[PDB]
Structures are given as C-alpha cells and as structure tokens.
Design a protein around this ligand. Structure first.
Ligand SMILES: NC(=[NH2+])NCCC[C@H](N)C(=O)O
Ligand SMILES: NC(=[NH2+])NCCC[C@H](N)C(=O)O
Ligand SMILES: NC(=[NH2+])NCCC[C@H](N)C(=O)O
Ligand SMILES: NC(=[NH2+])NCCC[C@H](N)C(=O)O
Ligand SMILES: NC(=[NH2+])NCCC[C@H](N)C(=O)O
Ligand SMILES: NC(=[NH2+])NCCC[C@H](N)C(=O)O
Lengths: 289, 289, 289, 289, 289, 289
C-alpha cells in the first residue's frame, strides 16, 4: 500500500552511496543473530547478492564461537581455561577449523548461492591467502599463552583481489598458517578489520546484536549515530565487555585507511542494505577525526 | 519520518530487477515533461547516473519537435505542410539537426554530467553509428513524400556497444546519413525501438505524459499495467493519435527480441527508478505473448 | 652412489611424457595409504608441486570414508544400514561434509602449500562448480534409496578451468548441491572420472593399495600393465569388490574421451612421478580399444 | 603527363616524415577558406583520412566566428560590444554552441566520413573531456569581462587518447564547462594549442589565409619558412592583428613541449599533405630555440 | 624546382591505395637488379620501411640463383645437370642455404634495418614456419628428379602473422624441411605466390628486369598495363622463358584469392612506391576475370 | 633393469630445481663435442625441448671457430695473423657470418625442431636485437687491432624476451652491427655471458670438453664442484689457456647478477639435464661470494 512517490524517494536516496561504493570492496563481519534466525540469514545472503549486482565487491568474514563450543561438547573434549579463555590445543584447533570451514562457512556459501554462482569459501590456508602470528592474551594483567590463536599477519592482497575481480564473494573462515605452516584460529572481528585494511576497502561493516554504540551504557541518551576515531578511542576504556572488540576493530580499520566503519544492528532485517543505501543507516558510523 | 523496516522493504524489492539488468543495455526514450520541468529533468539525469553506478548500461534517445518548431519560427522559415506534416527541406533539416544535437542533447549531457564523466552526445553521423532510409507518410491514405525524414536503416552495433563498454552513456540525437551521405531526421520513438533491438537491450523505456495505456480511452477502468504483444497489436487500430507511436515502438521492439518494453509516466519524479526497481512500476509493461 | 649416466637416462626418459602433458589437465584420485602414511602423503604433495612446476595442471579429488565413519562414532550418531550402505541422513551429510572439506581436504591443502601458494579447497557448492543428482544403489538386485548420495550431474567447466589457469591446484571434496540446492555426498572415484571427462583431462590417475589390475585374482600371472576398454569391460563382471569402482571410473573416463586412465600403486613413494614420467609406470594403464 | 621518376621522388621524400609521425598525435586547427571553398574543404577532409590510413592520429579543432555572427543576426539578437568584443551572454553562448557543434562541426564530420567511419564530434561537455576557465580581455589596457568566454583549463588526456586509440578522429567544437558546470566558448586557436600540449602531440598545424609568417609586413622579403621560439617571441609585439593569435598559439605549444608548430597556407589545396610530407612545406615551421 | 601543387597532386593520389592497404599484408618478391645496383637496393629497403610506417605489413621473399652458382664455383663443387637444371645434392643444398640465408638475406636485413628495428630473417626451418614437398621437373617432356628442390607444402599462417603483428618485416630465404625434416630449396617465385595466398595478402609484387608484360614479344605495342587471369592464362603457353615463372606465380596467387598481383620494373628506382601509390603503376597488374 | 624406487628418487630430486627454474631464462653456451658427435648433439637438442616442456626458457648461444677456418681454407682465402689471431677482414666477416648463421645455427635449429616448432635463428642484425662494439686484443702486452671483432654492446632485452615469451628458443649466432651498421663477429663465450646478464637469466651454462674446473692443473685433486666468484677471480691468472674464457664469462655473468654459472662436461650425454636437475651436477657451479 506504499505510494509510488515514497518508493521513488527511498530509491533515489541510494544514489550518492552507489556512486561511492561502485567498484569498491566492502568487508562485512557476519555474526550473531543475523546468522541464527532464518529470516535474518536469508536476507543477509540476499544483500550480498544485491551488492554484487550493483558492481560492488563484498567480502564476508564470519565467526562461530558458540558452534565450536557446541561441537567440542558433543565430542567430549574436556577444555582447559585460563581466565575466560579456552586453550586452543592442536585438537581444539582441528575442531574449530572443521566447524568454521566445514559447517558455518558452508551454510553461508549455500545461502548466497541460491542467488547465483557467487560465493566461495576460503581460509588463510588456501593459496596462502593470509598468515597468522601467535598472540598472547592478558589474564589478570599478565600476558598469557592460550594455544593456537593468533592475529592476521600478512595478506595476499593481489590474490584476494583477483578472486573478487573474478566476480566471486569470498566467504572467509579465519584460520591461517603461521610462518612454519602451523594453523591458528583468529578472532573474526580482528580479522575483518585486518582484511579491510589490507584490501583497501571503502567500508567495514560489523553486525552486532544492539542498535548501535552507547557511549555511557545503560543511558539511552548516550546512543550515537556517528563518531570519529579520536572521540571513540577516548571512550574505549569506558565501554562494556561486548562492544570492546567491535570498537577496537572499527578503530584499527579507519585509522588504517578504511574511510568508514559501521557497527550495525544485525537484528534488523536487511541491515546491510539499510546501512549502505540510506542516509540515516541503522547503527554507528565511524570515520577519521 | 519513514521507518527503517519500510526503507528495507523498498530496497530489498529491487534485488530481482538488479539481477536481471546487471551488465545489460536499457534504451530510454526521453521526452515530454520529464524534459521540460526542472525537477523532473534533474531526476531523470540522476537516474541515468544511478543505472551506471549499478553496472547497468543506459542509452538515451531524445526528440525535440516543439524546440524545432520554436527555432524555425524565430528564424522566419516558412513551412510547407502536407496533411499534418512539415516538409523537411534541406534548410529545415539543418535547423532540426542544430536544435536537436546542438541544444536539446547538450542540456541532457550536461545534466547527466553533473554526476560524473558519463554522457556523450552522438548522432548517426558520428563514426557512421547508424544510417537512415527515406520514408513516406500516408496522407489521406496515399503515400506522401515530406522531405528528409527517415527510419533507422542499419546500426553499427559493435561501435555502439564499444562506447557503452567504455562506461559512457550515449545521448542520441536522431539524425543519420542515408547511403549517399544525405542526413535525415528520424522520429525519436521509432529510432529508440530500432536501437533497442539492434543493441540487444534488456528493456526499452518510453516516457509519456500519461499514467499508462488505456485500452478504451477515456474509460478509467481500461488502464492496464501489463499486456502482451498479441493483445496489444489487436488494439492498436483502436488507440488514440498520441499513444499510437509509443505503442508501435513497444510492439516492434518486443517482437524484435527485447524482453520487455515500458510506457511509463514521465510526470512521476524518478519514474525510471520506479519502473525498473519496483514490482508494480508506474505505467504499462509490454512482453511477448 | 648412483652413476651420472644413469641419472641422465632416467631424466631423459621423461621427455615424451612432459611433451604430452605440458599445459594439460591431470585429475588425480587421492586415497588409501598415500593419504595415511606420512612419507607417502608428503611425497604425493611434492608431486603435485612437481606437476605445477612443469606447466602441468593437476586437479586432486579425494575421499575419506574411514574418517567419516570415525567421526560419526565419536559423535554417537547411530547409523542405519541397507545392505552394505549407510543411509546418508541430513545429519550424516553434515558430518561427511565437515570431515571431508574441513579436515581431510585441509590436510592436503596444507601439505601441498608447503611448496608454494598452489592448493585451494573446493566443493561443488563453491561458485556452483558442479551439481549432484540423487542416486539409488542396488541391494539384493532392487534399486534402493540410501539418502543424500549422488553422482556428479553438471560441471562448471569454464569456472574450473579458470581456477586452474590462475595457477591453482584445486583440491576437491566431493559434495555438491542438487538442482534444489540440497547438498549430496558423491563417491570420490565416480566424481574423479566425471571431472576428468568434463575438464578434457589428458590423464586420470587413481591411487589404489595394490600393484595394479589382476584380471584373474589371485593368479599372480594375471597382472597386466596395459589394457584397452573393450578387453577391460568384458572382465568387469569378473573382478573383485575392491577393484570394481576403480575400473568403472577408468572405463567411463576413457570412453568419455580422456586419452588414458591409470590405476597405480599408492604404496609406492612418488607413484605419481613414476606413472607419468617413466615408460613402465607402476600399475595399469587403460586406453581406448 | 607526369614522369614516373618524378612521382617516385615526391613519394620517397615523405619517408622521414612518415617515420616521425607514425603512431603520433597531430592537432590541426581548421578554419578560414579551407573551410569555405568546397574544393579546399573536401581536400582537407581527405587529408584527415590520409593521416588515419598511415597510422597517424589527427585531432581537428575548429572555429566558426563568422557563422556565429550570421546566426545571431538571423535571430535578431542585439549584441553588446566592449572594444572589439561581443559580450557572450547566456543567450549568445547557446547560439554559439548550437552553431559550432550543431552545424559547423557537423559539416566536417560528414565530409571526413565520406571516407570511412572516422570522425566523431565532441566538446568539452562530453565525458568531461576538458574544462574551461573564465578569461578577461584587455580593452584600452584594462582587464574587461566579456561574458562566458574562457581558456582551456584541464584536459581529460586519458579519455581523449582512448578515443584516438579507438581509431576515431575527434572533431572538436571548443565549448566546455567551468568548475561549476557553466559552459563557456573558447577561442579555437588557443584551444588547439592547449589540446596539442595536453595530448603530447608531435605537431600542431594552424591553417591561415596567407603564405606564411612575414616578420616585417608588408615587406615581401620578410617571409620566413622556419623560425625558433626565441626569435619569434621577440617579434610578436611587432606582428599584425591577424597573425598574433596564430603566433601565440604556436609559441605556447612548442614551449609547452610540442616538437613543432606550423602556420600553413589554407588556400593551398591539400596543404596538410604538403606541410607534413614534403621537406619544404607550405608556410612557417616553428621549433624550440 | 617542383611546384607545390604538383607535390600535392602526387601525394593526394596515394589516398585510395593507402586505404586499400592499411593493415594488410603485401608479399614482395625481391630479385634481379633491384638487388644488385646499390641505388636500387637502398631504395627498395627504404620502401619496406615506408610500408611499415604507413601501417602496412610487407613480407619479402628473395632468391639468389647467381650468388649460389658463384659460391659453388669458388668451392670447386662440380655440378651435374639434367636439361638446364643443376641437381641439388645434399652438398649443393648446404651451399644454397648458407648463401641464401647467410649472405643474401643478411644484406637485405641490414639495409632495411638502417631505418629501424624491422627486418628479421627466416626460412621454413625456423619455428616450422613452412614445409616443402619434393618436386620433379619436366626434361624433354618426361618428369625428372633433380635433387632436394621442392614447392611450399604448408604454411604456419598463424605464426607468420604473429611475427608481422609484432611489427617485423620477415625477410624470407626459401628453404624448408619436408615431412621427414630434410631441407629443400624452393624456387623463390613459386614460394612468394604460396606465401601470399597463405597469408591472405592484399597484393603480391614481383620485381623483374623489364617494363612489364609483353603479350607478343618483341612487339612493342603488345605491352599491357592490366590483364585478368582468364586472358593471361591463355597467353602463358605463348610467353618467353623468362616471364613464364613470374606469370605462373601471378596466376596462382590471384586465382588463390590474392586481389591483385603485379609484375613491376625493378630497374625503376622506388618501383614499389610507384606501383602501390600511383594510379598508373610501373608494370602489369593482374586481377581475377 | 632399473628398480622403480630408484627411478622415483632421481625424478623426485629434480623438484627444487624445477621450482627454481620455472618461468626463468637459462642461457646455454653450446660448443665443442656436444656439437660434433651425433649422439651428444641429438641429446642436447632434446634437452632444449625438455626445458621448454617444463615451462623453462632456454636461449642457446653457439660458436663455430673450426667450421669458419675450414670454410676459409676451402675458399682459398689467405689469412693474416697477429699473435694467435686471424684478422677479420670484411671478407673474413662475410664467411664467418655465412658459416655461423647459414650452416652451424641451421643444424641446431633443425635438430631442436624435430621436437616441435621451437627454435628460431637470430643474430644481432635481426630486429636490432643486439649491437657490437669493436675490441682490441693484447698481443705481446700491447693492444692490437684484428679487424671486425667485438663485444656485445647493448641488448634489445624487451624484443629478446618477447620472442622467448612467444614460446620460441632463440638460437643465437653471434654477429651484430656496430653503431654505424658494420657487422662484427663476437666471441661466443663472452656473448653468452652478456646475453645472460641482459636477460636476467637464472643460470648460465657453458659446455666444455673437461669434467670441470681444475684449480691447479694437472693435479687431479684440484677439481672443484662449487666455487664462489671471489675465490675464482684469484685463480684466473693461474688457469690454463683453454679455461680462461669460460671462467671470465662465468665471473662476469654472476657478478653481473646471474645467480649461478656452470662449466659442465659436454662429453656427458644429456649434460644439461644432469647439471640442472640433479643435486651433484656434472661440472663446476659458480655463485657469488
Ligand atoms: N550509522 C549511520 N549513521 N550510518 C549512516 C550511513 C551512511 C551511508 N549509507 C554510508 O554507508 O556511509
Ligand atoms: N508497468 C509495470 N507493471 N511495470 C512493472 C515493472 C517490473 C520490473 N521492475 C521491470 O522492470 O520489468
Ligand atoms: N601402467 C603403465 N604401464 N603405465 C605406463 C605409463 C606411461 C606414461 N608415463 C603415461 O603417463 O602414460
Ligand atoms: N614551413 C615549413 N618549412 N615546413 C617544413 C615541414 C617539414 C616536415 N614535413 C614537417 O612536417 O615538419
Ligand atoms: N601496372 C599497373 N597498372 N599498376 C596499377 C597499380 C594501381 C594501384 N596502385 C595498385 O596497387 O593496385
Ligand atoms: N657442478 C655442480 N656442483 N652443479 C650442481 C648443480 C645444482 C643444481 N642442479 C643447479 O642447477 O644449480
């Protein structure tokens, strides 16, 4: 029952964003509900097909922490924990890789591919597309080893951009070999920001389960729609557990040269379309300042 | 004040049409009000930039009958008329070409180019892009010569598609040489359909000053949103003066292989966006049947 | 302690085979011991790097039946069996895909990649590279359904050959969607022959755990080094359980246009090099006749 | 009745100039008689086809001052004059553009195209090929505004050279938008020199209605066949009204890097061929010194 | 002392021939005086540079009968003769190849290369560019073997056209292997016609030591400037010893699809330029009829 | 009678060298016995086909001193000698060029081409592929002129690499023009090293008639399998007449950037294969140090 002139206004408003994005890379960190509820996940897959059919170049990075825990429990693999961290033994790494690449990534490739021959699954292992470096975590303020977990080290930017030039949507499971060929599991938020910077992405989108960034949670009036890196970096020691990784990734990407990073509400159906192609978006847009 | 979920629905509905149009040619016959009121004309130019920034390949064909008459009166060139037709003397042809290519086309190239280096003006004279063949008209049921007017004869499909592959939007003024190099003026509606067929266009759009096709004017309930060629060809001897050329062009194009032709309401702001990227459109869609 | 002139003779003997294979596809069915003992598996990976560094285009197809059974037992998933066949429920399919693509294929990609950025893992799901069609099996001479198992239906030959032209070695896990997007598990021997035919491969190699084809097992003197399709098809109803699938795949590939198919001894270190680059080989070579 | 050995000598003498010009751009300023008498104009068009069929890349820049005045008088548009200059109102600009691009350029495109699909008409408006900057003129030694007239500001060298690489002969009407999109009329002599410098032309040719450059008009013995920029710049304050713009353009182009500039006698049939492919030429050749 | 307007007429007359030849192959049989007198040979080399610098694609085929005889006498190699034919022993073949490719061809490559990096020497041996088939000759009306002499059998048209596309002028010495790799000497006139047909040449030029074709030698009034294949084939049994091979080659080439073949006066300086770029030429032009 | 596992070991040992050489240039100086005994020469030709069919890019440089002397004696051309050097008169140069390019090079092109359309003969004259500069020699410690002999001056690296990219094996006869077009004969050892450096070759191979480099001839225990440039340059004033040119060429090439140079035993059948694809080789390998 929607009037024609309203349809026209919504469509026309996409023009400056289509201009900005045409022929550019967009890295999208996929996770949370958008990946659990069927309506949200089918809409997310459709939105990747949408970007491809505008001449835009999406790259999807996904996680799967809860799926990994679920499979480890099904296999009866007792975990060892340091602080809040499971130690990633070689056994845990094999399960993580098999879950992320062999199950979670598979769901997204198939959903996207209902729309066309677009998606292709990859890890850092394939064609040496990226490497990992082992990382410690701080437990009680002391650096602590927790096994085969790492950060992205180097990215085969040319090989990655060749795949995207071939018209493919890479669906990335974040595992990668270190310099000695030992595969590590990389946090998908930190990986998304590293890939965005390495590929020269125009935007980085990170789907979360909240409306946006509250600077003084739980004050409702502290929600912000736009913020620059300087202001944001001052509030990062203030933020709550959950938002800290998403914010750190937005900061590293935009300071690393990505023109804008977006923390968007993955509970909103077609949140990717709303963030990219409306003026208001549906979350918090981060830019340099 | 428009809710996010409504913005999402309008945007998401474009997906099947972006899939269908990506990398395809769309010929758009530009005329009437869309070319006279400033808001409509700036929106039309913006919509050509829109298609280009989705990876779609627009080709604009324009007329300018009233501008030609206006200039002939300013020059004091007395016309000779047979039935309702001005005879196109060599003098009239020179004025028509100078108005269409040197004024009317120039307005559209500049408007479009406010958005980027897209538009390029051309006639059939440039690079022998298409030729004309002289045509008679029927006056009182007898074939009548009215000077240097013609139909499109042959199209340099390769050279045309090369220009479009270069990322340009051709803005076409319909003049063209015959086999002896004598330039003729071609009716812009018939030319648009000839170009659409020659280029293998996915759609032909024809902007008119009415909501759509009324099959039994003035009965309001005879308006139709979709119709096939068989049904439409049976009503063409019934239709009113104004709709006949637009309908004949839709019939020739779709029978000539163009999957769909559209008679759309040029009085609707961003009518091109509404016709292409909504399910309902804003006019009459013609397909084979 | 090997004399120079002997080294020269072995190397020189490779010339006619390098001529025949340069720029050609070779599909290699990887399985059995060559995939279990560490020395054999590292040699197999090195041989894929060898072919790549001669300008040859290897494509590896692998199975993993025993790994799938092992994982199903670890998960406590009770199987239902018809004749000798496990029914592939949707649950069993998910485990099979996660084992084949997320563990077995991963081992080979990494081993190969110790030599360079060559290997890339793929299934039929990625970029719609190939499709599956559901297959029944004969149990007591009646066609029997055993769940989500299939044959290769169609192959995206162009997209596959593009990946190989990019200098990559595809490591193929044989899962693929049917026409409705439902993923099936395909027997890796039948898949290797289908891929070989579809890609226009020069040779198909199938690694087994025996010296070659005995036409009258267990008679030692019935081993053959070369045989044509006509003679071989007459003995297929005679052969033993294990050799039947390998022989059927060789027959379908060579009749399907692949110049030669090879059943080679995967227990021989560097068996791929020996089969391709010596006159005698190390198994049974099948050609049309 | 011309002896064979004389034909051979004339042809052979072209060799060093064909070597120098092969694959190079030549900008030709077309105007005066060469554009008014039918024999001269058909010969000029034939010479553009000649250069194209030697692998040379001509670019034609034309004026049309007298045609513009003629049309303004036919329309009854009263002019306002400052010194010797007509003020270019928005009305005058529209007429100038419609005359230059819609009539004058059209004649040349058609003449050239009698020889092949070579010529294409363009202004700075098309594909943003070049921009204009507003210019004052000195009237009684004080800077004076005379409306929408300008100099070439920037040139889309890549897009221009792409058109020429496509085998086309651009026929340029010198109108162009300023940074705000407002179209200006540019003096065709100054534009030709700007285009020559921007495209890296090997030569700039300027057709005039005199044998060449007389350094002390009217002394017959002051005619010169070659002169360098240093000597020429010293005589520019000495020269007569008519030669000053042609000389200033030759100076700016050759100092701007064009190896040679030529003021040639447009009254000589095939003057372009004579200047380029004989040692003596038919005018004055300017080089750096 | 030649007037400008005469220079213009000679140059302008080349236009239809430059149009016809642009981007086309011209095979030129080089021999006789044009290869002995220094002025003629330097002019011939300059004319090959001329064609290259018009975008034309010359291919030079040369002989060297007298040079071969001279070298055989210097080596004291006694000849055996059947009728008028020297038997080409393996020894004679080695001398012929070393003279033609190692001396005669070398002179032309160097002369041409004074003008640029154009010429490249080749025989049928190089890259298997063409093969030979052994030929008998008729001695007293009986077929007679005279050793390792042959006709062109097959031509590597693609490899030849690749060399010419690279901007090179092949200078061809007519030796070539038979199917068993045994090199034969091929008559350069017959080879030129075979190469012209194989490459799809626009013209074949054959330099001789006479004004043109006299149909009734020695009657001065029997000289002809143009003749078709039908008329010419009727006079071939009439012609004199010397003209027969040149005429047979023109007939085979034009009947084989080459639009025109030319027997031209190699004693005329720059005869190639005169034949190609004047209406009258300097010899006899053969076309189909 | 060679066991399979031995064949496998020899083949597998080639892998690191195929990796190092894939897509790289190898310059091979061909001379001595490898060019005189039929078995050695056919094996050398087969080895050039081998490298080509691994994706390696061989370039063959040959000499022919003894063949030149033999031909000069057959022609009765009295030589003039300064020290041990024949003065290369213009006559001697013509014979040298005709022998090297017209006989010696021809043998190798044909032998190689028994394997495919690979070999192409060239000198510095063809396409100006390289130039020569005149060189004096030291006779009794005073610089002495000995006619038209020279060193390589400059190399058309792009044109050379284009030929090799086309899949051809250049067979180079070392003659080349100086800056004035006068052709000189260049020592083939010095030329091979100059070409290797200019083309960025991975290896330079020089075939000699000895096992390798003896540092204290005739002490059998002074033979060395590997040596660096620093150690080698200290022994060059110690070495014997024959080895000095081969050693000087290895030194200039490796210091000039070629990773390794090899003096190998041309009396060993398939010595090229043994040197490149075994760890031990068959001679002396020189590297920087
Ligand atoms: N959270 C926001 N305020 N988002 C605004 C997004 C604006 C624009 N669509 C972009 O992609 O940058
Ligand atoms: N007048 C109509 N019913 N139009 C429907 C248009 C549907 C679709 N957007 C198309 O471009 O074909
Ligand atoms: N089992 C055999 N007889 N094998 C012979 C193999 C011969 C050759 N290397 C080939 O790849 O075809
Ligand atoms: N006015 C002259 N002197 N002209 C000489 C021209 C020489 C030569 N054809 C050139 O294009 O540069
Ligand atoms: N012998 C002759 N009549 N020659 C005329 C040659 C005409 C023209 N130049 C051509 O190349 O075909
Ligand atoms: N004379 C020697 N030691 N040679 C060793 C050669 C090693 C290796 N095949 C190479 O090409 O470099």
């Amino acid at each position: 029952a929607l009037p024609t002139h309203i349809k026209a206004q919504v469509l026309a408003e996409a023009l400056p964003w289509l201009k900005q994005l045409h022929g550019k890379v967009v890295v999208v960190k996929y996770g949370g509900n958008a990946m659990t509820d069927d309506t949200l996940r089918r809409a997310f897959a459709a939105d990747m097909a949408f970007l491809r059919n505008c001449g835009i170049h999406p790259v999807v990075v996904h996680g799967g922490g809860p799926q990994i825990t679920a499979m480890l429990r099904r296999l009866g693999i007792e975990g060892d924990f340091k602080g809040g961290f499971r130690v990633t033994t070689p056994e845990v790494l094999d399960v993580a890789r098999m879950v992320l690449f062999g199950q979670v990534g598979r769901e997204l490739v198939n959903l996207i591919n209902a729309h066309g021959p677009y998606a292709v699954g990859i890890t850092g292992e394939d064609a040496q597309l990226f490497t990992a470096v082992r990382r410690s975590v701080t437990v009680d303020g002391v650096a602590t080893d927790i096994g085969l977990v790492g950060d992205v080290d180097q990215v085969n930017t040319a090989a990655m951009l060749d795949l995207v030039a071939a018209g493919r949507i890479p669906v990335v499971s974040t595992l990668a070999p270190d310099a000695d060929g030992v595969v590590h599991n990389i946090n998908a938020d930190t990986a998304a920001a590293a890939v965005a910077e390495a590929l020269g992405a125009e935007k980085l989108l990170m789907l979360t389960d909240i409306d946006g960034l509250y600077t003084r949670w739980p004050d409702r009036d502290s929600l912000v729609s736009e913020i620059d890196t300087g202001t944001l970096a001052q509030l990062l020691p203030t933020l709550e557990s959950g938002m800290v990784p998403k914010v750190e990734a937005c900061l590293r990407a935009v300071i690393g040269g990505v023109p804008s990073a977006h923390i968007i509400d993955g509970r909103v159906t077609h949140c990717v379309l709303v963030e990219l192609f409306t003026d208001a978006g549906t979350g918090t847009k981060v830019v340099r300042g």
